[PDB]
């Protein structure tokens, strides 16, 4: 709760006459303070209409006796904004949502979301995936794997060179790529307008078959067999549901799966949508069950493993000894003591059900403000969420992918639109993109210069900024500072403890995480050409 307006009078006073913004502020504060109604986002905005007009005063009188006073109170006002987001406070709706598009489901996959069905029965369990987009990756490997040889061809007389610059044949590469990836699209844009009213999926068998040497037989049944895989698995499709409500959205995912490519990106906005709508928890496939607090309380860590390592091996355990999954890794375990390792399968073994192992979630009680994420190396990381339906906070972070598409859009959509190579189509992109560039805006101007390459070149890591953690951490920028639009701001780890996905509640040093936390980095660039270049001799 805030001061009243007459401590505000009392602390504030002074030998001048109240200013008019003076006067607004006082209102502002009164009429926050006689709120009855106890619904979160009425409380928020009223605050957030103070703290505007406190700005105002403070930025017209920057020599104001009042200042003091006001920074106080804008001080007040950030905690009163967590004040509000801890008052009312319930389970969120037992729901968990994965989402594997593009092709057919792992069984890899469906072990690890095995084990969140059976510690968490009452949960309901969706595998959100898109009935007509069976084929995209299988696309976008055919796409590639002919850029690569076509760029290796080209440059065989330079690759073997040890000197060689590596990135001479990924720039190369990425030209071949950009126009195989506009042929399907123009080729896609000719079809689907026609009374046939073909998918996705249709239109990419017969561009594969006509392109890529492929045999329609073979797709169709890869088709088939992967819809069918996904319905006897919670299986839910995008297409029969309510997920996209309008167009600008549904464009936005359709750009990801099919102008690009990039099924993550498509995920990061199918997860979104899906939380807005249904509520409950997100989670990426690699994600597996907390671990009970007090399992292997009883074992002492030895300092030579790192905080990390200690969680990997505590799963790797469970693993060897219950075996859970199939063929979980045991390298980290296997080493290094054998005491510990007796001592891990005295309790493992001391233990008879699974629901003895992991904890269950039973009620994650959030408030409708909110959204409650991961975090990774400081920052937030969006493969795991919690959220009610139509939350304050989703929106928030929806609002920020709208805005940063339609600004990508704005300046990507003449270049994409005219009849240019990738070397032209950028230039065009890169020219009106960076004409556009404040002091606000520079840095994510930088960071989605390289969109077109993502996935195909390293170090293009635009989708961070666009539909993945940074759009997270600006909107969390919004939410505790009352703001609105943020770009060039964002929030990390350490400043939102109040907001982060209990860490009782999930494990995140899993086998399948790690294994892909790979990043196109320069080092793993450097060892998928070697492989590149072994492979074509
Ligand atoms: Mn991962």
Do not use: C
């Not at 009213?197 to 006509?210: C, Q």
């Not at 549901?241 to 549904?250: A, G, M, P």
């Amino acid at each position: 709760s805030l001061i009243s307006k007459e401590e505000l009078i009392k602390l504030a006073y002074s030998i001048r006459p109240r200013e008019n913004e003076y006067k607004t502020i006082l209102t502002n504060l009164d009429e926050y303070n006689k709120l009855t109604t106890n619904n979160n986002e009425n409380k928020y905005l009223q605050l957030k209409k103070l703290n505007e007009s406190i700005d105002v005063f403070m930025n017209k009188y920057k020599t104001s006796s009042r200042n003091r006073a006001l920074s106080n109170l804008k001080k007040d006002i950030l905690k009163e904004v967590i004040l509000i987001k801890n008052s009312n406070t319930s389970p969120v709706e037992k729901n968990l949502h994965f989402v594997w598009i593009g092709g057919e489901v792992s069984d890899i996959a469906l072990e690890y979301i095995k084990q969140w069905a059976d510690i968490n029965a009452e949960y309901n369990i969706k595998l959100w995936y898109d009935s007509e987009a069976f084929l995209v990756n299988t696309l976008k490997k055919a796409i590639v794997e002919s850029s690569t040889t076509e760029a290796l061809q080209l440059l065989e007389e330079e690759i073997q060179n040890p000197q060689f610059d590596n990135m001479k044949f990924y720039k190369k590469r990425m030209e071949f790529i950009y126009d195989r990836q506009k042929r399907f699209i123009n080729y896609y844009k000719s079809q689907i307008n026609k009374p046939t009213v073909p998918t996705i999926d249709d239109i990419i068998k017969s561009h594969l078959v006509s392109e890529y040497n492929r045999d329609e037989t073979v797709l169709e049944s890869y088709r088939t067999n992967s819809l069918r895989k996904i319905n006897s698995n919670h299986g839910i499709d995008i297409r029969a549901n309510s997920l996209f409500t309008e167009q600008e959205l549904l464009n936005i995912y359709s750009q990801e799966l099919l102008n690009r490519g990039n099924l993550a990106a498509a995920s990061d906005i199918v997860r979104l949508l899906a939380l807005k709508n249904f509520g409950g928890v997100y989670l990426d496939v690699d994600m597996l069950p907390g671990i009970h607090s007090d399992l292997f309380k009883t074992i002492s860590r030895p300092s030579s493993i790192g905080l990390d390592r200690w969680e990997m091996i505590k799963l790797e355990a469970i693993m060897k000894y219950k075996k859970y999954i199939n063929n979980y890794t045991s390298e980290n375990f296997d080493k290094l003591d054998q005491q510990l390792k007796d001592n891990f399968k005295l309790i493992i073994e001391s233990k008879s059900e699974k629901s003895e192992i992991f904890s269950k979630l039973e009620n994650l009680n959030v408030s409708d403000l909110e959204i409650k994420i991961a975090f990774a190396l400081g920052s937030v990381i969006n493969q795991a969420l919690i959220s009610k339906q139509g939350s304050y906070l989703t929106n928030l972070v929806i609002e920020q992918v709208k805005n940063r598409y339609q600004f990508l859009n704005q300046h990507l959509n003449p270049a994409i639109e005219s009849d240019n190579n990738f070397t032209d189509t950028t230039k065009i992109f890169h020219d009106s993109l960076f004409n556009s560039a404040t002091a606000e805006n520079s840095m994510f101007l930088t960071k989605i210069a390289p969109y077109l390459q993502v996935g195909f070149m390293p170090e293009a890591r635009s989708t961070i900024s666009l539909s993945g953690p940074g759009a997270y951490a600006s909107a969390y920028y919004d939410f505790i500072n009352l703001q609105e639009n943020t770009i060039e701001k964002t929030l990390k780890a350490s400043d939102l403890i109040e907001f982060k996905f209990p860490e009782n509640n999930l494990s995140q040093l899993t086998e399948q995480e790690i294994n892909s936390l790979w990043s196109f980095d320069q080092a793993s660039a450097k060892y998928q050409f070697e492989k590149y270049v072994r492979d074509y001799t």
